[PDB]
């Protein structure tokens, strides 16, 4: 009820209000362990705020705890990466991990396997720049990732599981309406609206790809023990091989 009744303007307002804060990294030269340590320490702190943001994504608290857990386990790295890309928009060639950890490609990639991932993140940021992604659009896309990523991996076949998936699809349709509204407001033609909407959603394929690759890198770091993965991080990572 609560989320299916919001106006497009109210959806956007709710999502903007629910935005998590930008976290700082730690305050000389880097190494492989010290680099991933800052990023894993960061990610870990960002995950705690993400859960609190998810609770405020309209529709999300209507779902069972099992389902909210599954959606977050599936979506979390995609959500961290879209945030990073968003943050990095105005910094061509650099990833703004935190205001005090702005990392170039030009930075001597002390982490092995990290450059291909970095490059993909940069190209996404350049894509959002080219597109002139707006903040209101970003918050819509991030909510779509949360709701979409785990939706087809609900292998449950019952009457309580179809009513639930239909609810998540109803909420997804609303976020689509909200994106279209923003574009109409901005004065885009109907043909421009549909084209832009497609453009944005095709980026989510690329974001999924980056997460899939990122996760493999993480699992292989888990197996090294050169970095201290936190307890919550071990569990989120566990869910992708489980």
């Amino acid at each position: 009820s609560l989320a299916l009744s919001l106006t497009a303007d109210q959806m956007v307002s709710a999502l903007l209000d629910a935005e998590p804060p930008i976290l700082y990294s730690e305050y000389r030269p880097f190494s492989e362990a010290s680099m991933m340590g800052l990023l894993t320490n960061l990610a870990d702190r960002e995950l705690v705020h993400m859960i609190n943001w998810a609770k405020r994504v309209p529709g999300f608290v209507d779902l069972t705890l099992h389902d909210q857990v599954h959606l977050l386990e599936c979506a979390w790295l995609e959500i961290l990466m879209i945030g990073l890309v968003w943050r990095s928009m105005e910094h061509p060639g650099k990833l703004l991990f935190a205001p005090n950890l702005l990392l170039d490609r030009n930075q001597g990639k002390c982490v092995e396997g990290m450059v291909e991932i970095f490059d993909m993140l940069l190209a996404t940021s350049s894509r959002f720049r080219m597109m002139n992604l707006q903040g209101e659009e970003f918050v819509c896309l991030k909510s779509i990732i949360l709701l979409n990523s785990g939706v087809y991996t609900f292998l449950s076949s019952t009457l309580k599981s179809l009513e639930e998936k239909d609810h998540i699809h109803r909420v997804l349709d609303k976020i689509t309406d909200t994106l279209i509204h923003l574009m109409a407001k901005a004065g885009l033609t109907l043909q421009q609206q549909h084209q832009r909407l497609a453009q944005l959603l095709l980026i989510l394929s690329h974001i999924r790809h980056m997460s899939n690759k990122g996760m493999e890198h993480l699992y292989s770091m888990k197996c090294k023990n050169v970095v201290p993965l936190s307890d919550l991080l071990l569990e989120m990572l566990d869910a992708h091989r489980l």
Binding site: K55, L65, V69, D231, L232, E235, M236, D238, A239
Partner: peptide, 10 residues
């Protein structure tokens, strides 16, 4: 599989 469960309730 449970720390997240716990954050969601908390």
């Amino acid at each position: 599989h449970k720390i997240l469960h716990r954050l969601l309730q908390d």
